[PDB]
Paper text:
Herein, Moesziomyces aphidis DSM 70725 aromatic dioxygenase (MapADO) is characterized through X-ray crystallography, biophysical as well as biochemical assays, substrate docking and mutagenesis. MapADO features a seven-bladed β-propeller fold and a Fe2+ center coordinated by four histidine residues and shares a conserved structural motif with homologous enzymes despite low sequence identity (<38%). These enzymes primarily act on aromatic compounds with a hydroxy group in 4-position and use a mononuclear Fe2+ iron that is embraced by four histidines. O2 is activated by this nonheme iron and reacts with the C–C double bond of a substrate, eventually leading to C–C bond scission and two carbonyl species as the reaction products.
By analyzing the protein structure both in its native form and in complexes with vanillin 1, 4-hydroxybenzaldehyde (HBA, 3), and ortho-vanillin 5, we uncover the nuances of ligand binding and coordination within MapADO’s active site. MapADO was cocrystallized with excess (40-fold mol) ligands 3 and 1 (products of 3a and 1a cleavage, respectively). The ligands are well-described by their respective electron densities. K169 also stabilizes 1 by interacting with its methoxy oxygen. Adding equimolar 1 reduced 1a conversion by 60%, whereas 5a and 5 showed minor inhibitory effects (12% and 25%, respectively), pointing at higher affinity for 1 over its ortho-isomer. Structural analysis and site-directed mutagenesis indicate that two key residues (Y136 and K169), and the substrate’s hydroxy group, are essential for accurately positioning the double bond toward the activated oxygen at the Fe center. The sixth coordination site is occluded by T156.
Residue numbers in the entry: 24 to 548
Write the structure that this text describes.
Amino acid sequence: YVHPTDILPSGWPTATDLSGGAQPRRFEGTIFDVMTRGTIPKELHGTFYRIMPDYAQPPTYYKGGELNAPIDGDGTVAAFRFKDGKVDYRQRFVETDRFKVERRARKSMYGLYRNPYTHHPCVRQTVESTANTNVVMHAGRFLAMKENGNAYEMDPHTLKTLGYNPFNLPSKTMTAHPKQCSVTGNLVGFGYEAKGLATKDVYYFEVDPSGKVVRDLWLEAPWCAFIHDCALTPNYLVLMLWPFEANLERMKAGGHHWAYDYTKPITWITIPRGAKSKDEVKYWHWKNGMPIHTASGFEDEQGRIIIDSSLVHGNAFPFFPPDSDEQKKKQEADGTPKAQFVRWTIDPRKDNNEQLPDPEVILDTPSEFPQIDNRFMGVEYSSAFINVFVPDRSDGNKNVFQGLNGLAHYKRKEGTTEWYYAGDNCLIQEPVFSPRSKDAPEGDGFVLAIVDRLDLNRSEVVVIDTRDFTKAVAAVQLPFAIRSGIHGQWIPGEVTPDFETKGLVDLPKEEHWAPLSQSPYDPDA
Ligand SMILES: COc1cc(C=O)ccc1O
Ligand SMILES: [Fe+2]
Protein backbone atom coordinates (compact mmCIF):
# COMPACT_ATOMS: atom_id res chain seq x y z
CA TYR A 1 0.00 0.00 0.00
CA VAL A 2 2.99 2.26 0.84
CA HIS A 3 6.32 1.71 -0.95
CA PRO A 4 9.20 1.32 1.63
CA THR A 5 11.48 3.72 -0.31
CA ASP A 6 8.69 6.36 -0.35
CA ILE A 7 9.10 6.95 3.39
CA LEU A 8 12.81 7.71 2.90
CA PRO A 9 13.32 11.44 3.68
CA SER A 10 13.52 14.10 1.01
CA GLY A 11 15.65 17.24 1.39
CA TRP A 12 13.25 19.18 -0.89
CA PRO A 13 10.77 21.80 0.35
CA THR A 14 7.44 21.84 -1.50
CA ALA A 15 8.29 23.71 -4.71
CA THR A 16 5.02 24.47 -6.50
CA ASP A 17 4.50 26.06 -9.91
CA LEU A 18 1.40 28.20 -10.64
CA SER A 19 -0.70 25.09 -11.42
CA GLY A 20 -0.09 23.85 -7.84
CA GLY A 21 2.01 20.92 -9.14
CA ALA A 22 5.12 20.32 -7.04
CA GLN A 23 7.23 17.81 -8.99
CA PRO A 24 10.75 19.13 -9.90
CA ARG A 25 11.63 18.29 -13.50
CA ARG A 26 14.88 20.13 -14.29
CA PHE A 27 16.03 18.18 -17.31
CA GLU A 28 18.13 19.87 -19.95
CA GLY A 29 18.35 18.23 -23.34
CA THR A 30 16.63 17.29 -26.57
CA ILE A 31 14.37 14.91 -28.42
CA PHE A 32 14.79 14.62 -32.17
CA ASP A 33 11.52 13.93 -34.04
CA VAL A 34 9.20 13.99 -31.04
CA MET A 35 6.42 11.40 -31.21
CA THR A 36 3.25 12.89 -32.73
CA ARG A 37 -0.34 11.58 -32.96
CA GLY A 38 -2.35 12.75 -36.00
CA THR A 39 -0.95 15.03 -38.71
CA ILE A 40 1.30 18.01 -37.95
CA PRO A 41 0.12 20.92 -40.20
CA LYS A 42 2.72 21.65 -42.89
CA GLU A 43 1.79 25.33 -42.44
CA LEU A 44 3.60 25.34 -39.06
CA HIS A 45 7.04 26.85 -39.70
CA GLY A 46 8.52 28.14 -36.48
CA THR A 47 9.06 27.35 -32.81
CA PHE A 48 6.72 27.28 -29.84
CA TYR A 49 8.93 28.38 -26.96
CA ARG A 50 7.53 28.06 -23.45
CA ILE A 51 9.11 29.09 -20.16
CA MET A 52 8.55 27.52 -16.75
CA PRO A 53 9.71 27.99 -13.16
CA ASP A 54 11.64 24.90 -12.14
CA TYR A 55 13.90 25.48 -9.15
CA ALA A 56 17.20 23.88 -10.17
CA GLN A 57 18.39 23.40 -6.58
CA PRO A 58 16.13 22.71 -3.52
CA PRO A 59 15.47 26.32 -2.44
CA THR A 60 16.34 25.80 1.22
CA TYR A 61 18.44 28.97 1.91
CA TYR A 62 15.77 30.99 3.76
CA LYS A 63 13.48 29.39 6.36
CA GLY A 64 14.13 25.98 4.70
CA GLY A 65 12.40 27.28 1.52
CA GLU A 66 9.05 27.19 3.36
CA LEU A 67 7.92 30.51 1.81
CA ASN A 68 9.12 29.91 -1.79
CA ALA A 69 6.46 31.16 -4.19
CA PRO A 70 5.26 29.40 -7.43
CA ILE A 71 6.65 32.35 -9.40
CA ASP A 72 10.16 32.02 -7.91
CA GLY A 73 11.81 28.95 -9.55
CA ASP A 74 14.76 29.11 -12.03
CA GLY A 75 13.52 29.76 -15.58
CA THR A 76 13.78 26.88 -18.04
CA VAL A 77 12.80 27.21 -21.68
CA ALA A 78 11.25 24.37 -23.67
CA ALA A 79 11.34 24.80 -27.46
CA PHE A 80 9.15 22.83 -29.85
CA ARG A 81 10.36 23.44 -33.40
CA PHE A 82 7.96 22.66 -36.30
CA LYS A 83 9.42 22.35 -39.79
CA ASP A 84 7.92 20.31 -42.63
CA GLY A 85 5.68 18.40 -40.23
CA LYS A 86 8.60 17.29 -37.99
CA VAL A 87 8.83 18.47 -34.35
CA ASP A 88 12.02 18.65 -32.30
CA TYR A 89 12.24 19.55 -28.63
CA ARG A 90 14.96 21.15 -26.54
CA GLN A 91 14.82 22.30 -22.96
CA ARG A 92 17.42 24.27 -21.06
CA PHE A 93 17.76 26.44 -18.01
CA VAL A 94 18.45 30.12 -18.41
CA GLU A 95 21.97 30.65 -17.07
CA THR A 96 20.96 33.66 -14.93
CA ASP A 97 23.60 34.97 -12.53
CA ARG A 98 21.42 33.43 -9.80
CA PHE A 99 21.27 30.04 -11.47
CA LYS A 100 25.03 30.02 -12.04
CA VAL A 101 25.79 30.87 -8.41
CA GLU A 102 23.49 28.13 -7.16
CA ARG A 103 24.63 25.45 -9.60
CA ARG A 104 28.33 26.16 -8.94
CA ALA A 105 27.69 26.04 -5.16
CA ARG A 106 25.23 23.11 -5.46
CA LYS A 107 23.21 25.11 -2.92
CA SER A 108 20.28 27.55 -2.64
CA MET A 109 21.64 31.06 -1.90
CA TYR A 110 18.46 33.09 -2.48
CA GLY A 111 15.48 33.68 -0.20
CA LEU A 112 12.09 35.24 -0.70
CA TYR A 113 10.80 36.50 -4.04
CA ARG A 114 12.40 39.90 -4.77
CA ASN A 115 13.85 40.26 -1.25
CA PRO A 116 17.69 40.63 -1.28
CA TYR A 117 17.55 41.11 2.54
CA THR A 118 16.74 37.36 2.60
CA HIS A 119 19.47 36.31 0.14
CA HIS A 120 22.87 34.94 1.05
CA PRO A 121 25.25 37.83 1.95
CA CYS A 122 27.62 36.97 -0.93
CA VAL A 123 24.84 37.36 -3.56
CA ARG A 124 22.84 40.34 -2.23
CA GLN A 125 24.28 42.67 -4.86
CA THR A 126 23.62 40.28 -7.77
CA VAL A 127 20.81 40.44 -10.29
CA GLU A 128 18.34 38.13 -8.53
CA SER A 129 16.08 37.48 -11.57
CA THR A 130 15.30 33.82 -12.39
CA ALA A 131 14.22 34.94 -15.90
CA ASN A 132 11.23 32.60 -15.78
CA THR A 133 8.11 34.49 -16.97
CA ASN A 134 8.13 35.12 -20.73
CA VAL A 135 10.17 35.08 -23.94
CA VAL A 136 10.42 37.28 -27.04
CA MET A 137 12.36 37.32 -30.32
CA HIS A 138 13.17 40.97 -31.11
CA ALA A 139 15.82 42.45 -33.45
CA GLY A 140 17.16 38.90 -34.05
CA ARG A 141 17.74 38.29 -30.32
CA PHE A 142 15.89 35.69 -28.25
CA LEU A 143 15.21 36.88 -24.69
CA ALA A 144 14.05 35.29 -21.41
CA MET A 145 12.37 37.88 -19.15
CA LYS A 146 11.32 38.44 -15.54
CA GLU A 147 10.22 41.88 -14.35
CA ASN A 148 12.78 42.18 -11.50
CA GLY A 149 15.75 42.47 -13.92
CA ASN A 150 16.71 43.07 -17.54
CA ALA A 151 16.38 40.17 -20.00
CA TYR A 152 18.85 37.39 -20.53
CA GLU A 153 19.61 36.56 -24.18
CA MET A 154 19.79 32.95 -25.29
CA ASP A 155 20.75 31.26 -28.54
CA PRO A 156 17.41 30.33 -30.25
CA HIS A 157 18.67 26.91 -31.39
CA THR A 158 20.94 25.69 -28.57
CA LEU A 159 19.31 27.81 -25.83
CA LYS A 160 22.83 28.65 -24.60
CA THR A 161 22.78 31.83 -22.51
CA LEU A 162 24.58 34.65 -24.35
CA GLY A 163 24.39 37.66 -22.02
CA TYR A 164 22.35 40.07 -19.91
CA ASN A 165 20.57 43.29 -20.90
CA PRO A 166 21.27 42.99 -24.66
CA PHE A 167 19.58 46.34 -25.47
CA ASN A 168 21.55 48.07 -22.65
CA LEU A 169 18.48 49.52 -20.95
CA PRO A 170 19.42 52.11 -18.26
CA SER A 171 16.77 50.81 -15.86
CA LYS A 172 17.59 47.92 -13.54
CA THR A 173 14.42 46.13 -14.72
CA MET A 174 12.42 45.30 -17.79
CA THR A 175 8.83 44.07 -17.93
CA ALA A 176 8.30 40.46 -18.99
CA HIS A 177 5.37 41.84 -21.03
CA PRO A 178 6.87 44.08 -23.75
CA LYS A 179 4.71 44.39 -26.83
CA GLN A 180 6.00 44.10 -30.38
CA CYS A 181 4.26 46.86 -32.32
CA SER A 182 2.85 45.58 -35.61
CA VAL A 183 3.10 49.11 -37.11
CA THR A 184 6.66 50.19 -36.21
CA GLY A 185 8.09 46.78 -35.28
CA ASN A 186 9.25 48.43 -32.06
CA LEU A 187 9.49 46.44 -28.84
CA VAL A 188 7.50 48.71 -26.54
CA GLY A 189 7.75 48.26 -22.82
CA PHE A 190 8.73 49.59 -19.43
CA GLY A 191 10.50 48.60 -16.24
CA TYR A 192 9.20 49.43 -12.73
CA GLU A 193 11.29 49.67 -9.56
CA ALA A 194 13.59 51.00 -12.25
CA LYS A 195 16.10 52.45 -9.76
CA GLY A 196 16.17 49.57 -7.28
CA LEU A 197 14.21 47.86 -4.50
CA ALA A 198 10.89 49.55 -3.70
CA THR A 199 11.60 52.59 -5.95
CA LYS A 200 8.57 54.26 -7.56
CA ASP A 201 10.55 54.98 -10.74
CA VAL A 202 9.19 53.64 -14.02
CA TYR A 203 11.17 53.67 -17.27
CA TYR A 204 9.26 53.54 -20.58
CA PHE A 205 11.07 52.57 -23.80
CA GLU A 206 10.71 51.56 -27.43
CA VAL A 207 13.52 49.43 -28.89
CA ASP A 208 13.47 49.65 -32.67
CA PRO A 209 13.85 46.61 -35.06
CA SER A 210 17.60 47.24 -35.08
CA GLY A 211 17.90 46.75 -31.31
CA LYS A 212 18.34 50.43 -30.31
CA VAL A 213 16.31 52.49 -27.79
CA VAL A 214 14.62 55.11 -30.01
CA ARG A 215 12.13 56.49 -27.45
CA ASP A 216 12.16 56.51 -23.68
CA LEU A 217 10.91 58.39 -20.61
CA TRP A 218 11.47 58.34 -16.86
CA LEU A 219 8.33 58.68 -14.75
CA GLU A 220 6.86 57.36 -11.49
CA ALA A 221 3.97 55.23 -10.36
CA PRO A 222 1.60 56.69 -7.69
CA TRP A 223 2.90 54.04 -5.27
CA CYS A 224 5.44 51.25 -5.60
CA ALA A 225 2.98 48.96 -7.35
CA PHE A 226 3.23 45.52 -8.91
CA ILE A 227 3.03 46.47 -12.61
CA HIS A 228 3.08 43.08 -14.28
CA ASP A 229 1.48 43.77 -17.66
CA CYS A 230 0.46 46.57 -20.00
CA ALA A 231 -1.41 47.24 -23.23
CA LEU A 232 -0.07 48.74 -26.44
CA THR A 233 -2.22 50.96 -28.64
CA PRO A 234 -1.24 53.15 -31.67
CA ASN A 235 -0.62 56.18 -29.50
CA TYR A 236 -0.09 54.84 -25.94
CA LEU A 237 1.55 52.33 -23.70
CA VAL A 238 -0.88 51.68 -20.87
CA LEU A 239 0.51 50.23 -17.63
CA MET A 240 -1.71 48.08 -15.42
CA LEU A 241 -1.13 48.41 -11.65
CA TRP A 242 -2.06 45.52 -9.35
CA PRO A 243 -3.12 46.40 -5.77
CA PHE A 244 0.09 45.24 -4.13
CA GLU A 245 2.53 47.63 -2.52
CA ALA A 246 6.22 47.13 -1.77
CA ASN A 247 7.66 48.12 1.59
CA LEU A 248 11.42 48.33 2.15
CA GLU A 249 11.08 48.15 5.98
CA ARG A 250 9.04 44.93 5.68
CA MET A 251 11.70 43.46 3.38
CA LYS A 252 14.52 44.43 5.72
CA ALA A 253 12.60 42.66 8.51
CA GLY A 254 12.60 39.46 6.42
CA GLY A 255 9.02 39.81 5.09
CA HIS A 256 7.69 39.62 1.52
CA HIS A 257 8.36 42.23 -1.14
CA TRP A 258 4.63 42.66 -1.87
CA ALA A 259 1.50 42.76 0.27
CA TYR A 260 -1.97 42.84 -1.29
CA ASP A 261 -3.95 45.93 -0.32
CA TYR A 262 -7.76 45.79 -0.58
CA THR A 263 -7.79 49.63 -0.31
CA LYS A 264 -5.82 50.14 -3.54
CA PRO A 265 -7.89 50.65 -6.71
CA ILE A 266 -6.85 49.09 -10.01
CA THR A 267 -4.81 51.91 -11.55
CA TRP A 268 -3.70 52.55 -15.13
CA ILE A 269 -0.82 54.75 -16.31
CA THR A 270 -1.26 56.10 -19.84
CA ILE A 271 2.06 56.99 -21.50
CA PRO A 272 1.75 58.81 -24.85
CA ARG A 273 4.18 57.03 -27.18
CA GLY A 274 7.30 59.17 -27.70
CA ALA A 275 6.20 61.52 -24.83
CA LYS A 276 8.75 64.29 -24.18
CA SER A 277 7.76 64.92 -20.57
CA LYS A 278 6.35 62.93 -17.64
CA ASP A 279 3.75 65.72 -17.47
CA GLU A 280 2.05 63.97 -20.43
CA VAL A 281 1.52 60.78 -18.37
CA LYS A 282 -1.85 60.29 -16.62
CA TYR A 283 -3.06 58.03 -13.81
CA TRP A 284 -6.55 56.45 -14.10
CA HIS A 285 -8.32 54.45 -11.38
CA TRP A 286 -11.19 52.05 -10.92
CA LYS A 287 -11.70 49.91 -7.78
CA ASN A 288 -9.90 47.05 -6.03
CA GLY A 289 -9.26 43.77 -7.87
CA MET A 290 -6.50 41.91 -9.74
CA PRO A 291 -6.51 42.18 -13.55
CA ILE A 292 -3.68 39.76 -14.21
CA HIS A 293 -3.02 39.89 -17.98
CA THR A 294 -4.18 41.92 -20.91
CA ALA A 295 -5.26 40.30 -24.16
CA SER A 296 -4.35 43.46 -26.02
CA GLY A 297 -5.48 47.05 -26.46
CA PHE A 298 -6.43 49.43 -29.25
CA GLU A 299 -7.91 52.87 -29.88
CA ASP A 300 -11.49 52.85 -31.12
CA GLU A 301 -12.74 55.17 -33.89
CA GLN A 302 -13.26 58.00 -31.32
CA GLY A 303 -9.76 57.57 -29.81
CA ARG A 304 -10.84 55.70 -26.67
CA ILE A 305 -8.37 53.12 -25.28
CA ILE A 306 -10.05 49.69 -25.17
CA ILE A 307 -8.23 46.93 -23.26
CA ASP A 308 -9.45 43.43 -22.45
CA SER A 309 -8.03 41.65 -19.42
CA SER A 310 -8.64 38.93 -16.91
CA LEU A 311 -10.19 40.26 -13.71
CA VAL A 312 -9.97 38.47 -10.41
CA HIS A 313 -12.16 40.03 -7.72
CA GLY A 314 -9.59 39.51 -4.96
CA ASN A 315 -6.07 38.23 -4.48
CA ALA A 316 -5.01 35.64 -7.11
CA PHE A 317 -1.60 35.43 -5.32
CA PRO A 318 -2.75 34.62 -1.75
CA PHE A 319 0.88 33.68 -0.89
CA PHE A 320 1.50 37.48 -0.82
CA PRO A 321 -1.23 38.35 1.71
CA PRO A 322 -2.07 41.83 3.11
CA ASP A 323 0.01 43.29 5.96
CA SER A 324 -2.77 44.00 8.46
CA ASP A 325 -4.65 41.43 10.55
CA GLU A 326 -7.92 42.95 9.32
CA GLN A 327 -7.07 42.58 5.62
CA LYS A 328 -5.59 39.09 6.16
CA LYS A 329 -8.92 38.04 7.72
CA LYS A 330 -10.72 39.45 4.64
CA GLN A 331 -8.51 37.41 2.29
CA GLU A 332 -9.31 34.21 4.27
CA ALA A 333 -13.01 35.15 4.40
CA ASP A 334 -13.28 35.98 0.66
CA GLY A 335 -12.39 32.37 -0.25
CA THR A 336 -11.63 31.80 -3.94
CA PRO A 337 -12.40 35.12 -5.69
CA LYS A 338 -14.78 35.49 -8.60
CA ALA A 339 -12.82 35.61 -11.87
CA GLN A 340 -13.86 36.85 -15.33
CA PHE A 341 -12.56 38.27 -18.62
CA VAL A 342 -13.50 41.96 -18.99
CA ARG A 343 -13.16 45.04 -21.24
CA TRP A 344 -11.94 48.46 -19.97
CA THR A 345 -12.62 51.84 -21.59
CA ILE A 346 -10.13 54.64 -20.91
CA ASP A 347 -11.33 57.71 -22.77
CA PRO A 348 -8.42 60.25 -22.89
CA ARG A 349 -10.95 63.09 -23.54
CA LYS A 350 -12.21 62.54 -19.95
CA ASP A 351 -10.84 63.91 -16.67
CA ASN A 352 -8.48 61.20 -15.36
CA ASN A 353 -9.38 62.20 -11.76
CA GLU A 354 -12.86 60.77 -12.37
CA GLN A 355 -13.21 57.05 -11.59
CA LEU A 356 -13.22 54.87 -14.71
CA PRO A 357 -16.49 53.22 -15.81
CA ASP A 358 -17.08 49.65 -14.70
CA PRO A 359 -15.46 47.20 -17.14
CA GLU A 360 -17.78 45.17 -19.38
CA VAL A 361 -17.94 41.41 -18.69
CA ILE A 362 -16.81 39.57 -21.84
CA LEU A 363 -16.49 36.05 -20.42
CA ASP A 364 -18.22 35.20 -17.17
CA THR A 365 -15.77 32.38 -16.38
CA PRO A 366 -12.27 32.22 -14.81
CA SER A 367 -9.95 33.30 -17.60
CA GLU A 368 -6.19 33.71 -17.74
CA PHE A 369 -3.15 33.74 -20.05
CA PRO A 370 -4.83 35.41 -23.07
CA GLN A 371 -3.00 35.92 -26.33
CA ILE A 372 -3.93 37.51 -29.63
CA ASP A 373 -3.01 37.18 -33.30
CA ASN A 374 0.38 38.98 -33.05
CA ARG A 375 -0.09 40.45 -36.54
CA PHE A 376 -2.55 42.85 -34.79
CA MET A 377 -0.43 44.00 -31.85
CA GLY A 378 -0.84 47.71 -31.01
CA VAL A 379 -3.71 48.13 -33.51
CA GLU A 380 -7.38 47.14 -33.47
CA TYR A 381 -7.69 43.36 -32.92
CA SER A 382 -10.66 40.96 -32.63
CA SER A 383 -9.35 37.43 -31.83
CA ALA A 384 -8.32 36.45 -28.33
CA PHE A 385 -7.18 32.96 -27.34
CA ILE A 386 -7.84 32.53 -23.65
CA ASN A 387 -6.98 29.86 -21.10
CA VAL A 388 -10.27 29.13 -19.27
CA PHE A 389 -12.13 27.15 -16.67
CA VAL A 390 -14.56 25.44 -19.03
CA PRO A 391 -18.20 26.43 -18.10
CA ASP A 392 -19.99 23.52 -16.36
CA ARG A 393 -16.88 21.30 -16.66
CA SER A 394 -14.49 22.86 -14.10
CA ASP A 395 -14.29 23.36 -10.39
CA GLY A 396 -14.72 27.15 -9.69
CA ASN A 397 -13.28 26.90 -6.16
CA LYS A 398 -9.76 26.42 -7.55
CA ASN A 399 -7.37 29.39 -7.63
CA VAL A 400 -7.45 30.91 -11.14
CA PHE A 401 -4.06 29.41 -12.09
CA GLN A 402 -4.95 25.91 -10.85
CA GLY A 403 -8.17 24.94 -12.67
CA LEU A 404 -7.49 26.00 -16.27
CA ASN A 405 -8.78 23.07 -18.31
CA GLY A 406 -9.85 24.65 -21.57
CA LEU A 407 -9.22 27.25 -24.24
CA ALA A 408 -11.57 29.85 -25.65
CA HIS A 409 -11.39 31.51 -29.02
CA TYR A 410 -13.21 34.84 -28.58
CA LYS A 411 -13.85 37.07 -31.60
CA ARG A 412 -14.96 40.59 -30.67
CA LYS A 413 -16.14 41.51 -34.21
CA GLU A 414 -18.41 38.40 -34.55
CA GLY A 415 -19.24 38.42 -30.81
CA THR A 416 -18.63 34.63 -30.76
CA THR A 417 -16.74 32.32 -28.37
CA GLU A 418 -15.62 28.76 -29.28
CA TRP A 419 -14.35 26.32 -26.66
CA TYR A 420 -11.68 23.61 -26.46
CA TYR A 421 -11.87 21.14 -23.56
CA ALA A 422 -8.45 19.74 -22.46
CA GLY A 423 -10.01 16.41 -21.44
CA ASP A 424 -10.87 14.68 -18.20
CA ASN A 425 -7.91 14.60 -15.77
CA CYS A 426 -6.22 17.26 -17.89
CA LEU A 427 -5.07 20.82 -17.51
CA ILE A 428 -4.08 23.04 -20.43
CA GLN A 429 -1.68 26.01 -20.40
CA GLU A 430 -1.51 29.29 -22.32
CA PRO A 431 -2.39 29.13 -26.05
CA VAL A 432 -0.31 30.56 -28.89
CA PHE A 433 -1.48 31.25 -32.44
CA SER A 434 0.21 30.68 -35.78
CA PRO A 435 -1.51 32.15 -38.87
CA ARG A 436 -2.36 29.61 -41.61
CA SER A 437 -0.29 31.77 -44.01
CA LYS A 438 1.14 35.30 -43.89
CA ASP A 439 -2.07 36.79 -45.38
CA ALA A 440 -4.59 34.45 -43.66
CA PRO A 441 -7.55 36.37 -42.05
CA GLU A 442 -7.09 37.39 -38.39
CA GLY A 443 -7.34 34.36 -36.10
CA ASP A 444 -7.28 31.86 -39.00
CA GLY A 445 -4.63 29.23 -38.37
CA PHE A 446 -3.43 26.96 -35.61
CA VAL A 447 -3.52 27.20 -31.83
CA LEU A 448 -0.93 25.31 -29.80
CA ALA A 449 -0.87 24.68 -26.04
CA ILE A 450 0.74 22.38 -23.49
CA VAL A 451 -1.63 19.78 -22.01
CA ASP A 452 -0.87 18.08 -18.70
CA ARG A 453 -2.02 14.45 -18.85
CA LEU A 454 -2.36 14.33 -15.08
CA ASP A 455 -2.90 10.59 -14.80
CA LEU A 456 -0.09 9.78 -17.28
CA ASN A 457 2.88 11.77 -15.83
CA ARG A 458 3.37 13.36 -19.25
CA SER A 459 2.95 16.62 -21.12
CA GLU A 460 1.74 17.02 -24.70
CA VAL A 461 1.45 19.86 -27.21
CA VAL A 462 -2.02 19.98 -28.75
CA VAL A 463 -2.51 21.54 -32.18
CA ILE A 464 -5.98 22.93 -33.00
CA ASP A 465 -7.19 24.26 -36.35
CA THR A 466 -9.30 27.44 -35.77
CA ARG A 467 -11.69 26.15 -38.48
CA ASP A 468 -12.81 23.64 -35.81
CA PHE A 469 -11.72 24.94 -32.44
CA THR A 470 -13.37 22.07 -30.49
CA LYS A 471 -10.98 19.40 -31.91
CA ALA A 472 -7.22 18.77 -31.85
CA VAL A 473 -5.72 17.88 -35.24
CA ALA A 474 -2.53 16.55 -33.67
CA ALA A 475 -0.76 15.99 -30.38
CA VAL A 476 3.01 16.14 -29.84
CA GLN A 477 3.64 13.50 -27.22
CA LEU A 478 6.59 13.91 -24.87
CA PRO A 479 7.85 10.76 -23.06
CA PHE A 480 7.65 12.73 -19.80
CA ALA A 481 6.03 15.69 -18.03
CA ILE A 482 7.47 19.20 -17.96
CA ARG A 483 6.66 21.91 -15.38
CA SER A 484 3.42 23.75 -15.83
CA GLY A 485 4.73 27.04 -17.21
CA ILE A 486 3.95 30.74 -17.37
CA HIS A 487 4.07 32.18 -20.91
CA GLY A 488 5.16 30.90 -24.27
CA GLN A 489 5.26 32.38 -27.73
CA TRP A 490 4.83 31.26 -31.29
CA ILE A 491 7.99 32.54 -32.96
CA PRO A 492 7.85 32.30 -36.78
CA GLY A 493 10.78 30.70 -38.61
CA GLU A 494 11.01 33.87 -40.76
CA VAL A 495 12.06 36.00 -37.72
CA THR A 496 14.47 33.40 -36.27
CA PRO A 497 18.13 33.80 -37.41
CA ASP A 498 19.31 30.76 -39.43
CA PHE A 499 15.98 28.93 -39.03
CA GLU A 500 16.57 27.51 -42.55
CA THR A 501 19.94 25.94 -41.67
CA LYS A 502 19.93 25.24 -37.91
CA GLY A 503 17.66 22.90 -35.99
CA LEU A 504 17.21 22.50 -32.24
CA VAL A 505 19.29 19.31 -32.53
CA ASP A 506 22.56 19.26 -34.48
CA LEU A 507 22.77 16.39 -36.97
CA PRO A 508 25.61 13.86 -36.50
CA LYS A 509 28.34 13.87 -39.18
CA GLU A 510 27.77 12.11 -42.48
CA GLU A 511 31.11 10.25 -42.70
CA HIS A 512 31.01 6.69 -41.28
CA TRP A 513 33.09 5.88 -38.22
CA ALA A 514 33.73 2.37 -39.45
CA PRO A 515 35.66 1.12 -42.52
CA LEU A 516 33.86 -0.76 -45.30
CA SER A 517 35.86 -3.92 -44.31
CA GLN A 518 34.01 -4.11 -40.96
CA SER A 519 30.56 -4.71 -42.50
CA PRO A 520 29.18 -8.18 -41.62
CA TYR A 521 27.67 -8.24 -45.13
CA ASP A 522 29.67 -9.32 -48.15
CA PRO A 523 27.97 -8.70 -51.57
CA ASP A 524 29.89 -11.74 -52.89
CA ALA A 525 28.68 -14.13 -50.14
C1 LIG B 1 6.74 33.81 -13.10
O1 LIG B 1 7.06 35.08 -12.53
C2 LIG B 1 6.02 35.97 -12.34
C3 LIG B 1 4.73 35.78 -12.80
C4 LIG B 1 3.73 36.74 -12.54
C5 LIG B 1 2.36 36.47 -13.00
O2 LIG B 1 2.10 35.52 -13.75
C6 LIG B 1 4.07 37.91 -11.88
C7 LIG B 1 5.39 38.14 -11.49
C8 LIG B 1 6.37 37.17 -11.70
O3 LIG B 1 7.66 37.42 -11.33
FE1 LIG C 1 2.58 37.33 -17.17
